Design a protein around this motif. Sequence first.
Motif, short mmCIF file in Angstrom:
data_model
loop_
_atom_site.label_atom_id
_atom_site.label_comp_id
_atom_site.label_asym_id
_atom_site.label_seq_id
_atom_site.Cartn_x
_atom_site.Cartn_y
_atom_site.Cartn_z
N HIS A 33 0.83 -1.20 0.00
CA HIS A 33 0.00 0.00 0.00
C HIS A 33 0.87 1.26 0.00
CE1 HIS A 33 -3.68 -2.36 1.07
NE2 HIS A 33 -2.76 -3.16 1.57
N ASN A 35 4.36 1.52 -1.61
CA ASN A 35 4.96 1.66 -2.94
C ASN A 35 3.92 1.41 -4.03
OD1 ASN A 35 8.04 2.15 -3.19
ND2 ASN A 35 7.87 0.79 -1.41
N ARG A 36 2.79 0.83 -3.64
CA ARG A 36 1.72 0.54 -4.59
C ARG A 36 2.18 -0.47 -5.63
NH1 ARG A 36 3.46 5.83 -3.29
NH2 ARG A 36 2.72 6.99 -5.13
N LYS A 37 2.84 -1.54 -5.17
CA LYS A 37 3.33 -2.58 -6.06
C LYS A 37 2.87 -3.95 -5.61
CE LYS A 37 7.94 -2.99 -5.42
NZ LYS A 37 7.88 -2.92 -6.91
N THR A 38 2.79 -4.89 -6.55
CA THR A 38 2.36 -6.25 -6.24
C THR A 38 3.34 -7.28 -6.79
OG1 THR A 38 0.81 -5.90 -8.08
CG2 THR A 38 -0.12 -6.05 -5.86
#
Length: 49
Positions: A33, A35-38
Amino acid sequence: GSSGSSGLDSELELPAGWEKIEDPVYGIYYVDHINRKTQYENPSGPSSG
């Protein structure tokens, strides 16, 4: 980009912001939540930035 290796230790938890999710359709995916990366990989370990 970057060169080298990553994800050496897979026996450590994830840092702040990161949160693994278990789904029978998506499976195991870490959602950051911050770095907003998956990514399924575990950036856990001695790595500053």
